[PDB]
Design a protein around this nucleic acid. Structure first.
Ligand SMILES: Nc1ncnc2c1ncn2[C@@H]1O[C@H](CSCC[C@H](N)C(=O)O)[C@@H](O)[C@H]1O
Ligand SMILES: OC[C@@]1(O)OC[C@@H](O)[C@@H](O)[C@@H]1O
Ligand SMILES: OC[C@H]1O[C@H](O)[C@H](O)[C@@H](O)[C@@H]1O
Ligand SMILES: OC[C@H]1O[C@H](O)[C@H](O)[C@@H](O)[C@@H]1O
Ligand SMILES: [Cl-]
Ligand SMILES: [Mg+2]
Ligand SMILES: [Mg+2]
Ligand SMILES: [Zn+2]
Ligand SMILES: [Zn+2]
Lengths: 299, 114
RNA sequence: AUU
Protein backbone atom coordinates (compact mmCIF):
# COMPACT_ATOMS: atom_id res chain seq x y z
CA UNK A 1 0.00 0.00 0.00
CA UNK A 2 3.14 2.26 0.23
CA UNK A 3 3.72 4.57 -2.84
CA UNK A 4 7.13 2.93 -3.42
CA UNK A 5 5.31 -0.46 -3.81
CA UNK A 6 4.35 0.34 -7.48
CA UNK A 7 8.01 1.20 -8.35
CA UNK A 8 10.54 -1.54 -9.35
CA UNK A 9 12.45 -0.80 -6.10
CA UNK A 10 13.91 1.93 -3.87
CA UNK A 11 17.11 3.98 -4.36
CA UNK A 12 19.14 5.24 -1.34
CA UNK A 13 17.92 8.83 -0.69
CA UNK A 14 20.44 11.70 -1.05
CA UNK A 15 20.34 12.76 2.65
CA UNK A 16 21.42 9.22 3.72
CA UNK A 17 24.45 9.46 1.39
CA UNK A 18 25.51 12.72 3.15
CA UNK A 19 25.73 11.22 6.68
CA UNK A 20 28.84 9.95 8.56
CA UNK A 21 27.41 6.84 10.25
CA UNK A 22 29.47 4.14 12.02
CA UNK A 23 28.88 0.60 10.66
CA UNK A 24 26.21 -1.32 12.62
CA UNK A 25 24.75 -4.83 12.26
CA UNK A 26 21.98 -4.91 9.61
CA UNK A 27 18.62 -5.79 11.28
CA UNK A 28 15.78 -5.70 8.71
CA UNK A 29 12.25 -5.77 10.18
CA UNK A 30 11.20 -8.26 7.40
CA UNK A 31 14.58 -10.09 7.04
CA UNK A 32 14.30 -13.26 4.90
CA UNK A 33 10.56 -12.82 4.08
CA UNK A 34 9.61 -14.43 0.72
CA UNK A 35 7.87 -12.46 -2.06
CA UNK A 36 4.83 -13.89 -3.92
CA UNK A 37 5.95 -13.79 -7.58
CA UNK A 38 3.83 -14.24 -10.74
CA UNK A 39 3.17 -17.98 -11.29
CA UNK A 40 6.28 -19.91 -12.51
CA UNK A 41 8.62 -16.84 -12.39
CA UNK A 42 12.08 -17.35 -10.81
CA UNK A 43 13.35 -14.88 -8.15
CA UNK A 44 16.23 -13.75 -10.41
CA UNK A 45 13.96 -13.20 -13.44
CA UNK A 46 11.86 -10.94 -11.14
CA UNK A 47 14.95 -9.26 -9.58
CA UNK A 48 16.77 -8.55 -12.90
CA UNK A 49 13.48 -7.34 -14.43
CA UNK A 50 13.16 -4.79 -11.58
CA UNK A 51 16.86 -3.77 -11.93
CA UNK A 52 16.36 -3.19 -15.71
CA UNK A 53 13.07 -1.30 -15.06
CA UNK A 54 15.04 1.01 -12.72
CA UNK A 55 17.97 1.40 -15.19
CA UNK A 56 15.32 2.53 -17.77
CA UNK A 57 14.75 5.67 -15.60
CA UNK A 58 18.48 6.71 -15.76
CA UNK A 59 20.55 8.44 -18.50
CA UNK A 60 22.21 5.20 -19.76
CA UNK A 61 24.22 5.60 -22.98
CA UNK A 62 22.80 3.12 -25.56
CA UNK A 63 24.96 3.17 -28.71
CA UNK A 64 24.43 1.01 -31.80
CA UNK A 65 26.33 -2.32 -31.35
CA UNK A 66 26.31 -1.86 -27.55
CA UNK A 67 28.70 -4.09 -25.51
CA UNK A 68 27.57 -5.57 -22.18
CA UNK A 69 29.43 -7.95 -19.85
CA UNK A 70 27.66 -9.88 -17.03
CA UNK A 71 29.77 -11.36 -14.17
CA UNK A 72 28.31 -13.96 -11.76
CA UNK A 73 25.77 -15.09 -14.41
CA UNK A 74 25.67 -18.79 -13.36
CA UNK A 75 23.46 -20.29 -10.64
CA UNK A 76 22.76 -23.45 -8.59
CA UNK A 77 20.06 -24.16 -11.25
CA UNK A 78 22.75 -24.54 -14.01
CA UNK A 79 20.99 -21.81 -16.12
CA UNK A 80 21.36 -17.97 -16.33
CA UNK A 81 18.02 -16.25 -15.52
CA UNK A 82 19.69 -12.82 -15.24
CA UNK A 83 21.39 -13.21 -18.65
CA UNK A 84 17.98 -14.15 -20.18
CA UNK A 85 16.46 -10.91 -18.76
CA UNK A 86 19.43 -8.77 -19.94
CA UNK A 87 19.07 -10.35 -23.46
CA UNK A 88 15.33 -9.42 -23.40
CA UNK A 89 16.01 -5.85 -22.17
CA UNK A 90 18.96 -4.87 -24.41
CA UNK A 91 18.47 -3.79 -28.05
CA UNK A 92 18.57 -6.68 -30.57
CA UNK A 93 22.17 -7.19 -31.77
CA UNK A 94 23.72 -5.96 -28.49
CA UNK A 95 26.85 -8.05 -27.79
CA UNK A 96 26.34 -9.78 -24.41
CA UNK A 97 29.16 -11.73 -22.74
CA UNK A 98 28.63 -13.53 -19.44
CA UNK A 99 30.88 -15.32 -16.98
CA UNK A 100 30.94 -17.44 -13.80
CA UNK A 101 33.36 -19.58 -11.75
CA UNK A 102 31.12 -22.62 -12.52
CA UNK A 103 29.81 -23.99 -15.85
CA UNK A 104 26.20 -23.04 -16.76
CA UNK A 105 23.83 -22.85 -19.80
CA UNK A 106 23.54 -19.28 -21.22
CA UNK A 107 21.74 -17.15 -23.87
CA UNK A 108 24.80 -14.83 -24.05
CA UNK A 109 26.78 -14.41 -27.32
CA UNK A 110 29.85 -15.82 -25.48
CA UNK A 111 30.36 -17.34 -21.98
CA UNK A 112 33.71 -17.51 -20.08
CA UNK A 113 33.99 -20.11 -17.26
CA UNK A 114 36.57 -19.48 -14.53
CA UNK A 115 37.47 -17.08 -11.70
CA UNK A 116 36.69 -13.53 -12.92
CA UNK A 117 40.37 -12.67 -12.18
CA UNK A 118 41.27 -14.90 -15.21
CA UNK A 119 39.01 -12.90 -17.61
CA UNK A 120 40.83 -10.55 -20.04
CA UNK A 121 39.23 -8.37 -22.75
CA UNK A 122 41.06 -6.27 -25.35
CA UNK A 123 37.92 -4.05 -25.73
CA UNK A 124 36.01 -1.59 -23.48
CA UNK A 125 32.36 -2.15 -22.41
CA UNK A 126 29.28 0.14 -22.30
CA UNK A 127 27.62 -1.64 -19.33
CA UNK A 128 29.02 -3.97 -16.61
CA UNK A 129 26.58 -6.04 -14.49
CA UNK A 130 27.87 -8.13 -11.56
CA UNK A 131 25.82 -10.51 -9.37
CA UNK A 132 28.93 -12.23 -7.94
CA UNK A 133 28.80 -13.28 -4.25
CA UNK A 134 31.45 -15.41 -2.46
CA UNK A 135 29.69 -18.26 -0.57
CA UNK A 136 32.34 -17.91 2.21
CA UNK A 137 30.80 -14.46 3.00
CA UNK A 138 28.09 -16.42 4.94
CA UNK A 139 30.81 -17.56 7.42
CA UNK A 140 30.88 -14.33 9.56
CA UNK A 141 33.59 -14.93 12.22
CA UNK A 142 34.96 -11.36 12.73
CA UNK A 143 34.24 -7.63 12.27
CA UNK A 144 32.50 -6.80 8.93
CA UNK A 145 35.44 -5.29 6.96
CA UNK A 146 35.83 -4.37 3.25
CA UNK A 147 36.07 -7.57 1.15
CA UNK A 148 38.68 -8.17 -1.58
CA UNK A 149 38.46 -11.22 -3.91
CA UNK A 150 36.30 -10.46 -6.99
CA UNK A 151 35.72 -6.84 -5.80
CA UNK A 152 39.44 -6.10 -6.39
CA UNK A 153 39.04 -7.39 -9.97
CA UNK A 154 35.79 -5.41 -10.54
CA UNK A 155 37.39 -2.09 -9.41
CA UNK A 156 40.32 -2.64 -11.80
CA UNK A 157 38.02 -3.82 -14.64
CA UNK A 158 35.84 -0.66 -14.32
CA UNK A 159 38.92 1.65 -14.36
CA UNK A 160 40.57 -0.17 -17.32
CA UNK A 161 37.70 -1.58 -19.43
CA UNK A 162 34.60 0.63 -18.94
CA UNK A 163 34.02 3.18 -21.74
CA UNK A 164 33.64 6.80 -20.58
CA UNK A 165 29.84 7.39 -20.49
CA UNK A 166 29.35 3.70 -19.58
CA UNK A 167 27.47 2.44 -16.51
CA UNK A 168 27.66 -0.37 -13.93
CA UNK A 169 25.31 -2.29 -11.59
CA UNK A 170 27.37 -4.25 -8.98
CA UNK A 171 25.59 -6.39 -6.38
CA UNK A 172 26.54 -5.88 -2.70
CA UNK A 173 25.06 -7.10 0.62
CA UNK A 174 25.68 -6.21 4.29
CA UNK A 175 28.82 -8.45 4.33
CA UNK A 176 29.61 -8.62 0.55
CA UNK A 177 30.99 -5.11 -0.10
CA UNK A 178 34.20 -3.21 -0.90
CA UNK A 179 35.25 0.32 0.18
CA UNK A 180 37.16 1.01 -3.10
CA UNK A 181 33.98 0.19 -5.11
CA UNK A 182 31.98 2.85 -3.20
CA UNK A 183 34.91 5.29 -3.75
CA UNK A 184 34.74 4.58 -7.55
CA UNK A 185 31.00 5.42 -7.54
CA UNK A 186 32.31 9.02 -7.17
CA UNK A 187 33.91 8.68 -10.66
CA UNK A 188 30.41 8.60 -12.32
CA UNK A 189 28.07 11.52 -13.08
CA UNK A 190 25.62 9.95 -10.60
CA UNK A 191 25.37 6.85 -8.39
CA UNK A 192 23.03 5.08 -6.01
CA UNK A 193 22.39 1.87 -4.05
CA UNK A 194 19.20 0.28 -5.49
CA UNK A 195 17.06 -2.29 -3.63
CA UNK A 196 14.63 -4.38 -5.68
CA UNK A 197 11.07 -4.53 -4.31
CA UNK A 198 10.93 -8.35 -4.80
CA UNK A 199 14.02 -8.90 -2.57
CA UNK A 200 13.54 -5.95 -0.15
CA UNK A 201 13.81 -8.48 2.78
CA UNK A 202 17.54 -8.84 1.90
CA UNK A 203 20.48 -6.44 2.62
CA UNK A 204 21.25 -6.93 -1.11
CA UNK A 205 21.51 -3.80 -3.26
CA UNK A 206 22.93 -2.95 -6.66
CA UNK A 207 25.55 -0.19 -6.56
CA UNK A 208 24.76 1.70 -9.77
CA UNK A 209 27.31 4.04 -11.37
CA UNK A 210 25.67 6.07 -14.17
CA UNK A 211 27.90 7.67 -16.91
CA UNK A 212 31.59 6.97 -16.13
CA UNK A 213 33.81 10.12 -16.14
CA UNK A 214 37.19 8.34 -15.57
CA UNK A 215 38.02 10.83 -12.77
CA UNK A 216 36.55 11.60 -9.32
CA UNK A 217 33.72 14.20 -9.38
CA UNK A 218 33.29 13.69 -5.58
CA UNK A 219 35.45 12.05 -2.86
CA UNK A 220 33.57 9.10 -1.27
CA UNK A 221 34.88 7.29 1.86
CA UNK A 222 33.71 3.69 1.19
CA UNK A 223 33.69 2.63 4.87
CA UNK A 224 31.44 5.61 5.74
CA UNK A 225 29.20 5.10 2.66
CA UNK A 226 28.57 1.38 3.46
CA UNK A 227 27.71 2.40 7.08
CA UNK A 228 25.32 5.04 5.60
CA UNK A 229 23.76 2.32 3.38
CA UNK A 230 23.16 -0.04 6.36
CA UNK A 231 21.74 2.87 8.43
CA UNK A 232 19.28 3.64 5.59
CA UNK A 233 18.24 -0.06 5.36
CA UNK A 234 17.91 -0.41 9.19
CA UNK A 235 15.62 2.65 9.51
CA UNK A 236 13.59 2.28 6.28
CA UNK A 237 11.73 -1.04 6.05
CA UNK A 238 10.69 -1.76 2.43
CA UNK A 239 7.44 -3.71 1.75
CA UNK A 240 7.98 -6.71 -0.59
CA UNK A 241 6.30 -5.94 -3.93
CA UNK A 242 6.02 -7.59 -7.38
CA UNK A 243 3.57 -4.91 -8.67
CA UNK A 244 6.03 -3.61 -11.35
CA UNK A 245 6.47 -7.11 -12.92
CA UNK A 246 2.89 -7.11 -14.28
CA UNK A 247 3.34 -4.23 -16.80
CA UNK A 248 6.13 -5.07 -19.30
CA UNK A 249 4.80 -2.75 -22.09
CA UNK A 250 7.72 -0.24 -21.66
CA UNK A 251 10.41 -2.74 -20.60
CA UNK A 252 12.88 -2.76 -23.56
CA UNK A 253 15.86 -0.38 -23.23
CA UNK A 254 15.28 2.48 -25.75
CA UNK A 255 17.86 2.50 -28.59
CA UNK A 256 19.21 6.09 -28.25
CA UNK A 257 21.87 5.55 -30.97
CA UNK A 258 24.36 7.28 -28.59
CA UNK A 259 27.47 8.57 -30.42
CA UNK A 260 30.69 6.51 -29.96
CA UNK A 261 34.03 8.31 -30.50
CA UNK A 262 37.71 7.61 -29.69
CA UNK A 263 39.33 10.57 -27.81
CA UNK A 264 42.84 10.56 -26.23
CA UNK A 265 43.14 11.50 -22.50
CA UNK A 266 43.64 15.29 -22.87
CA UNK A 267 40.82 15.93 -25.41
CA UNK A 268 38.24 15.20 -22.63
CA UNK A 269 37.29 18.89 -21.98
CA UNK A 270 34.38 20.25 -19.84
CA UNK A 271 32.17 20.16 -23.01
CA UNK A 272 32.91 16.40 -23.47
CA UNK A 273 32.36 15.76 -19.70
CA UNK A 274 28.94 17.48 -20.01
CA UNK A 275 27.92 15.13 -22.90
CA UNK A 276 29.21 12.07 -20.93
CA UNK A 277 27.29 13.24 -17.80
CA UNK A 278 24.00 13.42 -19.81
CA UNK A 279 24.27 9.92 -21.37
CA UNK A 280 24.86 11.45 -24.86
CA UNK A 281 28.38 10.08 -25.50
CA UNK A 282 30.45 6.86 -25.24
CA UNK A 283 34.27 7.18 -25.50
CA UNK A 284 36.10 4.01 -26.64
CA UNK A 285 37.56 2.35 -29.76
CA UNK A 286 35.10 0.27 -31.84
CA UNK A 287 37.52 -2.63 -32.62
CA UNK A 288 36.41 -6.30 -32.78
CA UNK A 289 35.43 -7.74 -29.34
CA UNK A 290 38.03 -10.31 -28.18
CA UNK A 291 37.85 -12.03 -24.75
CA UNK A 292 39.80 -14.80 -23.03
CA UNK A 293 40.08 -16.77 -19.77
CA UNK A 294 43.56 -17.65 -18.40
CA UNK A 295 43.93 -21.43 -17.82
CA UNK A 296 46.37 -22.67 -15.11
CA UNK A 297 48.08 -25.87 -16.38
CA UNK A 298 48.94 -28.65 -13.83
CA UNK A 299 49.62 -32.45 -13.67
CA UNK B 1 27.98 -45.11 -32.61
CA UNK B 2 26.28 -41.88 -31.39
CA UNK B 3 24.12 -41.21 -28.26
CA UNK B 4 20.44 -40.51 -29.15
CA UNK B 5 19.52 -38.03 -26.35
CA UNK B 6 16.21 -37.02 -28.06
CA UNK B 7 14.92 -40.64 -28.09
CA UNK B 8 16.26 -41.21 -24.53
CA UNK B 9 14.32 -38.16 -23.18
CA UNK B 10 11.08 -39.13 -25.06
CA UNK B 11 11.38 -42.71 -23.63
CA UNK B 12 12.07 -41.24 -20.13
CA UNK B 13 8.87 -39.08 -20.32
CA UNK B 14 6.81 -42.09 -21.55
CA UNK B 15 8.06 -44.08 -18.47
CA UNK B 16 6.68 -41.40 -16.06
CA UNK B 17 9.93 -39.37 -15.75
CA UNK B 18 9.75 -35.81 -14.31
CA UNK B 19 10.22 -33.16 -17.07
CA UNK B 20 13.51 -31.15 -17.08
CA UNK B 21 13.06 -28.28 -14.58
CA UNK B 22 14.49 -24.72 -14.40
CA UNK B 23 13.47 -23.68 -17.94
CA UNK B 24 13.68 -19.83 -17.59
CA UNK B 25 10.19 -18.33 -17.96
CA UNK B 26 10.22 -14.64 -18.95
CA UNK B 27 7.91 -11.79 -17.87
CA UNK B 28 6.16 -10.35 -20.97
CA UNK B 29 2.94 -8.62 -22.16
CA UNK B 30 1.38 -11.83 -23.65
CA UNK B 31 0.34 -9.57 -26.63
CA UNK B 32 3.17 -10.86 -28.92
CA UNK B 33 3.12 -12.41 -32.44
CA UNK B 34 2.89 -16.01 -31.11
CA UNK B 35 5.74 -17.21 -33.40
CA UNK B 36 7.71 -20.25 -32.09
CA UNK B 37 11.35 -18.94 -31.81
CA UNK B 38 11.97 -15.16 -31.70
CA UNK B 39 14.72 -12.58 -30.88
CA UNK B 40 12.56 -11.32 -27.94
CA UNK B 41 9.58 -12.77 -25.97
CA UNK B 42 6.57 -12.99 -28.36
CA UNK B 43 4.10 -15.03 -26.26
CA UNK B 44 0.44 -14.38 -27.11
CA UNK B 45 -2.40 -14.85 -24.55
CA UNK B 46 -2.21 -18.68 -25.08
CA UNK B 47 1.56 -19.03 -24.49
CA UNK B 48 4.54 -18.58 -22.11
CA UNK B 49 7.96 -17.29 -23.33
CA UNK B 50 11.18 -18.98 -22.14
CA UNK B 51 14.91 -18.29 -22.53
CA UNK B 52 15.88 -20.56 -25.46
CA UNK B 53 19.10 -22.15 -24.12
CA UNK B 54 17.28 -23.35 -20.93
CA UNK B 55 14.73 -25.21 -23.17
CA UNK B 56 17.36 -26.94 -25.40
CA UNK B 57 17.93 -30.64 -24.51
CA UNK B 58 21.49 -30.50 -25.99
CA UNK B 59 22.43 -27.27 -24.14
CA UNK B 60 20.92 -28.59 -20.82
CA UNK B 61 22.50 -32.13 -21.03
CA UNK B 62 25.89 -30.70 -22.21
CA UNK B 63 25.91 -32.85 -25.39
CA UNK B 64 26.66 -32.08 -29.09
CA UNK B 65 23.78 -30.56 -31.17
CA UNK B 66 22.56 -33.04 -33.85
CA UNK B 67 23.87 -31.33 -37.06
CA UNK B 68 27.29 -31.00 -38.81
CA UNK B 69 28.25 -27.51 -37.42
CA UNK B 70 26.57 -28.27 -34.03
CA UNK B 71 24.49 -25.04 -34.29
CA UNK B 72 21.73 -24.33 -31.69
CA UNK B 73 18.46 -22.77 -32.99
CA UNK B 74 17.28 -21.88 -29.40
CA UNK B 75 20.36 -20.38 -27.61
CA UNK B 76 20.16 -16.54 -27.50
CA UNK B 77 16.49 -16.54 -28.58
CA UNK B 78 13.08 -16.98 -26.85
CA UNK B 79 10.81 -19.99 -27.39
CA UNK B 80 6.99 -19.62 -27.12
CA UNK B 81 5.35 -22.71 -25.51
CA UNK B 82 1.55 -23.22 -25.35
CA UNK B 83 0.45 -22.56 -21.72
CA UNK B 84 -1.10 -26.10 -21.61
CA UNK B 85 2.37 -27.61 -22.42
CA UNK B 86 4.56 -25.15 -20.39
CA UNK B 87 5.26 -27.88 -17.76
CA UNK B 88 7.82 -29.45 -20.20
CA UNK B 89 9.33 -26.86 -22.62
CA UNK B 90 12.33 -29.13 -23.48
CA UNK B 91 9.95 -31.95 -24.51
CA UNK B 92 7.74 -29.55 -26.50
CA UNK B 93 10.63 -28.10 -28.61
CA UNK B 94 11.99 -31.67 -29.10
CA UNK B 95 8.63 -33.20 -30.28
CA UNK B 96 7.36 -30.24 -32.40
CA UNK B 97 8.35 -28.50 -35.69
CA UNK B 98 8.28 -24.78 -36.70
CA UNK B 99 6.48 -23.77 -39.95
CA UNK B 100 9.17 -22.39 -42.34
CA UNK B 101 6.44 -20.11 -43.85
CA UNK B 102 4.55 -18.39 -40.93
CA UNK B 103 7.09 -19.16 -38.12
CA UNK B 104 4.32 -20.66 -35.91
CA UNK B 105 4.45 -24.18 -34.36
CA UNK B 106 2.77 -26.78 -36.60
CA UNK B 107 -0.44 -27.80 -34.74
CA UNK B 108 -0.19 -24.83 -32.31
CA UNK B 109 -0.60 -21.64 -34.41
CA UNK B 110 0.31 -22.49 -38.04
CA UNK B 111 -2.88 -22.11 -40.17
CA UNK B 112 -1.11 -22.49 -43.59
CA UNK B 113 -3.05 -25.77 -44.27
CA UNK B 114 -6.39 -23.83 -44.21
C1' A C 1 23.77 -14.10 -2.88
C1' U C 2 21.28 -18.44 -6.48
C1' U C 3 13.22 -16.62 -2.38
N1 LIG D 1 35.56 -14.89 -8.09
C1 LIG D 1 34.47 -15.19 -8.80
N2 LIG D 1 34.59 -15.28 -10.14
C2 LIG D 1 33.51 -15.63 -10.85
N3 LIG D 1 32.28 -15.90 -10.43
C3 LIG D 1 32.19 -15.82 -9.09
C4 LIG D 1 33.22 -15.48 -8.23
N4 LIG D 1 32.76 -15.48 -6.92
C5 LIG D 1 31.50 -15.85 -7.01
N5 LIG D 1 31.09 -16.03 -8.31
C6 LIG D 1 29.77 -16.47 -8.76
O1 LIG D 1 28.77 -15.60 -8.29
C7 LIG D 1 27.52 -16.30 -8.48
C8 LIG D 1 26.50 -15.84 -7.47
S1 LIG D 1 24.89 -16.60 -7.79
C9 LIG D 1 24.41 -15.65 -9.26
C10 LIG D 1 22.98 -15.82 -9.75
C11 LIG D 1 22.80 -15.38 -11.21
N6 LIG D 1 23.16 -13.96 -11.37
C12 LIG D 1 21.35 -15.58 -11.67
O2 LIG D 1 20.94 -14.87 -12.61
O3 LIG D 1 20.61 -16.42 -11.15
C13 LIG D 1 27.85 -17.79 -8.37
O4 LIG D 1 27.46 -18.50 -9.54
C14 LIG D 1 29.37 -17.82 -8.17
O5 LIG D 1 29.98 -18.92 -8.80
O1 LIG E 1 11.35 -26.30 -16.67
C1 LIG E 1 9.95 -26.15 -16.51
C2 LIG E 1 9.60 -25.59 -15.14
O2 LIG E 1 8.22 -25.32 -15.08
O3 LIG E 1 9.98 -26.58 -14.18
C3 LIG E 1 9.71 -26.21 -12.82
C4 LIG E 1 10.42 -24.93 -12.42
O4 LIG E 1 11.83 -25.16 -12.39
C5 LIG E 1 10.09 -23.82 -13.41
O5 LIG E 1 10.85 -22.65 -13.12
C6 LIG E 1 10.37 -24.29 -14.84
O6 LIG E 1 10.00 -23.29 -15.77
O1 LIG F 1 27.76 -21.15 -9.88
C1 LIG F 1 26.68 -21.57 -9.03
C2 LIG F 1 27.18 -22.21 -7.73
O2 LIG F 1 28.10 -21.35 -7.01
C3 LIG F 1 27.58 -20.44 -6.04
O3 LIG F 1 28.66 -19.80 -5.37
C4 LIG F 1 26.67 -21.09 -5.00
O4 LIG F 1 27.22 -21.07 -3.67
C5 LIG F 1 26.27 -22.51 -5.38
O5 LIG F 1 25.09 -22.87 -4.65
C6 LIG F 1 26.00 -22.64 -6.87
O6 LIG F 1 25.69 -24.01 -7.17
O1 LIG G 1 3.97 -12.31 -0.21
C1 LIG G 1 4.27 -10.96 0.17
C2 LIG G 1 4.05 -10.02 -1.02
O2 LIG G 1 4.89 -10.49 -2.07
C3 LIG G 1 4.59 -10.17 -3.44
O3 LIG G 1 5.77 -9.61 -4.02
C4 LIG G 1 3.33 -9.34 -3.77
O4 LIG G 1 3.63 -8.14 -4.50
C5 LIG G 1 2.44 -8.97 -2.59
O5 LIG G 1 1.10 -8.95 -3.11
C6 LIG G 1 2.59 -9.97 -1.45
O6 LIG G 1 1.78 -9.58 -0.34
CL1 LIG H 1 20.66 9.35 -14.29
MG1 LIG I 1 16.98 -21.86 -4.79
MG1 LIG J 1 15.60 -12.98 -0.64
ZN1 LIG K 1 21.23 -25.83 -27.62
ZN1 LIG L 1 2.45 -21.87 -41.33
Amino acid sequence: NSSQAWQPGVAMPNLYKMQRMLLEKCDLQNYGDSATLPKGIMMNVAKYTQLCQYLNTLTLAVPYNMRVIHFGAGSDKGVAPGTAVLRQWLPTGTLLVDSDLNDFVSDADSTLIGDCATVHTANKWDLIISDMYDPKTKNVTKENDSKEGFFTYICGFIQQKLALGGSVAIKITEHSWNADLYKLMGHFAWWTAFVTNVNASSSEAFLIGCNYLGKPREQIDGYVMHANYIFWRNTNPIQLSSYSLFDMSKFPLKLRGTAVMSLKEGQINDMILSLLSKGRLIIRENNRVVISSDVLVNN
Amino acid sequence: FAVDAAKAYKDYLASGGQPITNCVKMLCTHTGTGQAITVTPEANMDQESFGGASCCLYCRCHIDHPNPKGFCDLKGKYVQIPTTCANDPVGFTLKNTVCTVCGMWKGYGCSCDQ
